[PDB]
Amino acid sequence: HVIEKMHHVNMTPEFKELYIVREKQINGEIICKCGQAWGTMMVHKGLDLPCLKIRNFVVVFKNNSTKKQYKKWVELPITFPNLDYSE
Amino acid sequence: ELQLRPYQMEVAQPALEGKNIIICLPTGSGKTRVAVYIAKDHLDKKKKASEPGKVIVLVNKVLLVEQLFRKEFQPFLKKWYRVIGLSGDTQLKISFPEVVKSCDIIISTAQILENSLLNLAGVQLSDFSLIIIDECHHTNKEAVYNNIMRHYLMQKLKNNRLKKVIPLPQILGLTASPGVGGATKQAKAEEHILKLCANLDAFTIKTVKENLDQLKNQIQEPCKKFAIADREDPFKEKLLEIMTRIQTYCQMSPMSDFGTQPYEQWAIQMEKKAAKEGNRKERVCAEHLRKYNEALQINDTIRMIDAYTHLETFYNEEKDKKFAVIEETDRFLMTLFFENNKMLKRLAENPEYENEKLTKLRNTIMEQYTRTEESARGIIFTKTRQSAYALSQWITENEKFAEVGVKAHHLIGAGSSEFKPMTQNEQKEVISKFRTGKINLLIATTVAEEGLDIKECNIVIRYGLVTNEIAMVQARGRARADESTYVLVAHSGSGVIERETVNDFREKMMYKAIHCVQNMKPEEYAHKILELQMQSIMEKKMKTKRNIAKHYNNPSLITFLCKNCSVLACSGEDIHVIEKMHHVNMTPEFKELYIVREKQINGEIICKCGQAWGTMMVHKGLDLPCLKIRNFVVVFKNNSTKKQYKKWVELPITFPNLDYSE
Amino acid sequence: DTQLKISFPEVVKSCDIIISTAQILENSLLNLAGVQLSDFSLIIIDECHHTNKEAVYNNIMRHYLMQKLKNNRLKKVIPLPQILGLTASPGVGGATK
RNA sequence: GACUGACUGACUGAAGACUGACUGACUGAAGACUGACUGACUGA
RNA sequence: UCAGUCAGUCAGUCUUCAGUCAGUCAGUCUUCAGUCAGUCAGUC
Ligand SMILES: Nc1ncnc2c1ncn2[C@@H]1O[C@H](COP(=O)(O)OP(=O)(O)O)[C@@H](O)[C@H]1O
Numbered sequence: 001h002v003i004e005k006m007h008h009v010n011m012t013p014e015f016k017e018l019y020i021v022r023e024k025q026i027n028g029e030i031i032c033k034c035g036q037a038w039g040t041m042m043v044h045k046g047l048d049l050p051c052l053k054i055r056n057f058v059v060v061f062k063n064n065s066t067k068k069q070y071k072k073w074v075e076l077p078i079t080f081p082n083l084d085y086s087e
Numbered sequence: 088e089l090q091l092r093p094y095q096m097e098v099a100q101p102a103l104e105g106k107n108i109i110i111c112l113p114t115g116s117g118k119t120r121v122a123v124y125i126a127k128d129h130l131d132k133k134k135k136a137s138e139p140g141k142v143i144v145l146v147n148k149v150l151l152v153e154q155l156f157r158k159e160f161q162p163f164l165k166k167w168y169r170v171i172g173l174s175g176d177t178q179l180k181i182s183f184p185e186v187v188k189s190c191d192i193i194i195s196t197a198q199i200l201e202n203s204l205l206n207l208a209g210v211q212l213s214d215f216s217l218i219i220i221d222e223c224h225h226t227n228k229e230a231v232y233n234n235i236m237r238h239y240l241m242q243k244l245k246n247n248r249l250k251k252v253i254p255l256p257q258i259l260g261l262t263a264s265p266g267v268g269g270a271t272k273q274a275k276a277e278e279h280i281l282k283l284c285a286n287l288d289a290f291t292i293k294t295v296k297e298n299l300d301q302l303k304n305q306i307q308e309p310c311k312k313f314a315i316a317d318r319e320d321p322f323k324e325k326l327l328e329i330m331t332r333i334q335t336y337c338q339m340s341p342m343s344d345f346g347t348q349p350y351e352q353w354a355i356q357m358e359k360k361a362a363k364e365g366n367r368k369e370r371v372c373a374e375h376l377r378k379y380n381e382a383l384q385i386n387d388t389i390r391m392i393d394a395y396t397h398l399e400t401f402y403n404e405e406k407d408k409k410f411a412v413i414e415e416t417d418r419f420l421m422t423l424f425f426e427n428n429k430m431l432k433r434l435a436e437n438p439e440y441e442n443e444k445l446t447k448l449r450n451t452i453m454e455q456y457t458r459t460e461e462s463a464r465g466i467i468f469t470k471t472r473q474s475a476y477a478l479s480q481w482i483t484e485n486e487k488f489a490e491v492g493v494k495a496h497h498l499i500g501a502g503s504s505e506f507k508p509m510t511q512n513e514q515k516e517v518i519s520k521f522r523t524g525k526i527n528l529l530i531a532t533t534v535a536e537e538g539l540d541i542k543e544c545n546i547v548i549r550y551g552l553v554t555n556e557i558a559m560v561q562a563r564g565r566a567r568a569d570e571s572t573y574v575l576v577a578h579s580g581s582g583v584i585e586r587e588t589v590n591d592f593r594e595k596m597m598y599k600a601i602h603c604v605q606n607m608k609p610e611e612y613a614h615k616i617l618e619l620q621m622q623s624i625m626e627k628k629m630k631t632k633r634n635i636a637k638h639y640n641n642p643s644l645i646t647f648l649c650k651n652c653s654v655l656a657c658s659g660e661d662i663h664v665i666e667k668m669h670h671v672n673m674t675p676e677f678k679e680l681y682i683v684r685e686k687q688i689n690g691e692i693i694c695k696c697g698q699a700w701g702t703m704m705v706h707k708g709l710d711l712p713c714l715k716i717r718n719f720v721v722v723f724k725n726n727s728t729k730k731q732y733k734k735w736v737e738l739p740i741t742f743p744n745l746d747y748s749e
Numbered sequence: 750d751t752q753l754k755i756s757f758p759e760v761v762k763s764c765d766i767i768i769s770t771a772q773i774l775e776n777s778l779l780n781l782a783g784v785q786l787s788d789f790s791l792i793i794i795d796e797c798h799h800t801n802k803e804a805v806y807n808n809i810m811r812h813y814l815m816q817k818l819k820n821n822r823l824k825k826v827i828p829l830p831q832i833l834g835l836t837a838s839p840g841v842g843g844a845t846k
Numbered sequence: 847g848a849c850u851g852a853c854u855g856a857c858u859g860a861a862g863a864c865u866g867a868c869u870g871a872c873u874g875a876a877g878a879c880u881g882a883c884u885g886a887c888u889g890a
Numbered sequence: 891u892c893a894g895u896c897a898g899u900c901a902g903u904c905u906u907c908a909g910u911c912a913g914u915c916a917g918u919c920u921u922c923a924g925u926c927a928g929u930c931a932g933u934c
């Protein structure tokens with residue numbers, strides 16, 4: 001889900017269990033099992049929530065199993081729903 | 088004769104049947120009468136259906152308690168109900184819960200209720216039915232209203248958990264200008280209105296849309312008039328080269344010209360740094376030059392005499408403290424200061440030289456009162472208390488004022504370290520005299536911009552004031568009189584008229600935006616409102632955990648040192664607290680270290696340097712001197728860092744109370 | 750960078766000589782209330798050699814140019830503000846001819 | 847039988863000084879994060 | 891048509907700090923005036 005058309009982020013609780021936080025802190029950095037970073041913790045509208053950078057990941061489609069990357073988010077033709085804030 | 092004007096009944100229509108809502112009408116259109124009438128209907132109907140119904144009226148300024156008490160509630164309900172007016176100053180003789188249990192209409196200040204609600208016997212919000220909240224635009228980030236409404240909101244969400252209940256009392260709140268939170272977007276404005284609405288748990292703004300012209304006939308827009316001024320006198324520059332010599336002695340770089348707020352800020356912070364180093368021969372000089380700076384600032388604002396007296400008083404007591412120890416850079420100051428000050432008093436005494444602002448003020452006062460010919464009440468709004476009091480003296484002295492029949496007095500709040508603190512009883516009689524009219528000119532501070540209902544205010548005057556939009560809307564509202572004149576006085580040196588301009592545009596934004604939200608779709612309204620309700624609660628919880636974790640403590644770890652000197656004063660174990668309120672030391676050798684001094688019922692503590700430490704106090708039959716944490720320096724034992732704190736709450740140490748067996 | 754406290758259209762409506770960075774104006778012009786190019790009379794553009802393929806100046810001038818051609822359609826009008834631009838080296842687009 | 851002096855408490859009224867904490871507005875400074883756009887260079 | 895690097899511009903989200911000022915609230919003490927009532931002691 002996106003904040004103000006500006007920042008992509010994930011709320012999923014099991015997905016919260018997958019990663020690792022790390023501090024050197026006001027924000028935490030996400031760390032994979034490999035040790036590679038994924039995103040940064042952010043606080044918004046009174047919620048606690050970690051974001052992700054598309055550079056840190058790999059996209060996989062379902063019609064064609066091609067492995068692709070993008071440096072920024074604008075290349076990806078996907079459109080996301082905004083934030084149900086009722087949670 | 089509780090007969091409302093049409094528009095009043097019109098905007099009161101939704102309120103008559105539940106529907107906790109808000110009413111906003113432009114200033115001077117008697118919203119208090121709407122409150123009184125609604126209250127009568129609520130109590131009478133509840134009596135008809137025979138349920139325990141009550142109502143509490145919250146006000147945020149003490150003076151208004153007595154005003155609204157004896158002006159709109161007494162005269163209309165002396166036969167129907169038991170109304171009681173209570174404020175933090177009146178000596179109670181009975182606990183708050185029984186006060187409410189006796190009467191049914193309460194008029195009180197919000198802090199009282201909140202005190203009575205966090206004492207969990209106390210009281211529960213459910214004990215009430217109707218909550219009248221006057222001037223509720225103050226509902227903002229951790230204000231007195233926000234706490235109360237957050238309890239209410241928390242209970243409401245608990246009720247919704249129950250449904251998928253306990254009654255929550257109906258709510259009313261009165262405003263004149265909800266304002267914007269400093270917003271240059273249409274979105275942020277309308278958002279801000281929504282935030283206020285949700286925090287009030289309102290249903291609809293419900294502002295007039297029918298009876299427009301008669302309203303245009305009731306309220307009057309005052310005539311705006313601008314007084315802007317911009318004489319050479321050496322006194323400013325005379326202080327200038329004195330203080331530049333002072334700065335050059337220690338060769339400080341100012342980084343800015345003198346007499347400015349950044350310079351003062353820099354002076355304070357660098358003085359703190361110098362005290363951290365232990366650097367004498369600089370610290371004292373820094374403080375003294377600072378004193379010159381504030382003296383200059385007062386000097387531009389007000390006449391010369393008081394500004395000189397301020398400095399003279401400081402240096403007088405300075406040498407008075409110094410000579411006590413009798414019983415190098417120090418004298419380096421007074422030696423030149425005293426010759427200069429003798430000259431200054433010679434220069435200051437000359438009344439021909441005068442401030443530019445005061446000049447235009449004199450012009451404005453004389454012009455307005457003479458044009459009015461004995462039918463004129465004028466209110467002058469200022470910034471600092473001593474400004475008010477000195478301006479009163481300035482009125483007193485020059486006989487040219489009195490000949491015109493202007494009778495002036497100064498009105499300020501209660502509570503410093505200066506001429507004299509005016510007390511509540513005195514201001515109460517002062518407003519009494521002002522209503523009569525043998526006090527013709529009133530000089531006031533922030534205290535009285537919201538709620539005064541004097542029927543005759545031809546003149547409202549602002550003296551070099553800079554503020555947000557509500558504190559200007561209300562000020563223009565005070566002129567509750569015909570042909571009302573609003574005068575702004577300032578000099579073009581600072582950003583005053585530009586503040587007025589931006590305030591104007593901001594006002595227009597606010598009106599348009601409230602018209603925008605006025606016309607939203609109910610379901611979207613409900614969704615947005617609910618979401619905002621949530622937001623406040625979660626953020627409050629997050630702040631709660633942040634604070635409680637921030638609190639994190641050996642009571643012996645630290646030791647205290649002078650600032651002027653650095654001689655060790657005492658260690659952590661020597662300090663004990665009275666009633667969690669006042670820190671103090673009992674140690675007998677520590678009694679030998681310091682010096683008492685009197686001008687007295689209490690003695691002031693003096694160091695060997697001459698710097699003050701604390702004050703003598705007598706408690707529970709014991710004689711005992713206390714200390715102020717500002718007067719000292721903290722030293723830890725794990726890390727040798729030199730730190731200071733203005734108040735005691737910052738220090739994470741906890742102290743044992745007082746073994747009284749000694 | 751300066752913290753405004755008033756919307757751009759009122760800033761222009763108050764003063765008469767503005768000194769600003771081009772991105773500000775272009776932001777204020779694609780917000781269709783905003784502002785219209787016609788509200789101005791003289792457009793001083795310093796260091797205008799940057800007028801190139803989709804640069805900040807090119808967008809603004811393309812609105813101006815579009816309006817001018819619309820005016821010529823009208824003739825066969827709305828005033829178009831006078832333009833000034835300062836350069837030291839217009840340069841070449843990498844040209845050996 | 848009358849006189850005077852002093853003591854104490856309750857009631858009322860008033861108010862001189864001290865210190866403590868929370869809150870708002872103003873100004874000043876300010877650390878991090880992230881997003882998008884544009885140009886130049888090089889390369890295919 | 892694209893990728894990569896670098897530099898510049900603009901906009902959001904926050905957290906947090908200091909300083910002065912003004913307003914609100916609660917304590918511990920000390921002191922004074924006036925009236926009234928009560929107890930006690932002297933010399934006649
Ligand atoms: N029905 C009415 N008839 C006469 N005067 C009225 C009526 N309603 C309101 N007023 C005027 O309103 C004044 C009270 O206004 P108030 O509520 O104190 O101001 P605000 O509404 O700005 O708080 C009264 O002095 C009275 O003259």
Ligand code: ALF
Pocket residue numbers: 113114115116118119263537538539564
């Ligand atoms: F509008 Al008011 F006091 F309520 F001036």
Ligand SMILES: [Mg+2]
Pocket residue numbers: 118119537538
């Ligand atoms: Mg009012």
Ligand SMILES: [Zn+2]
Pocket residue numbers: 649650651652653654694695696697698
């Ligand atoms: Zn010392």
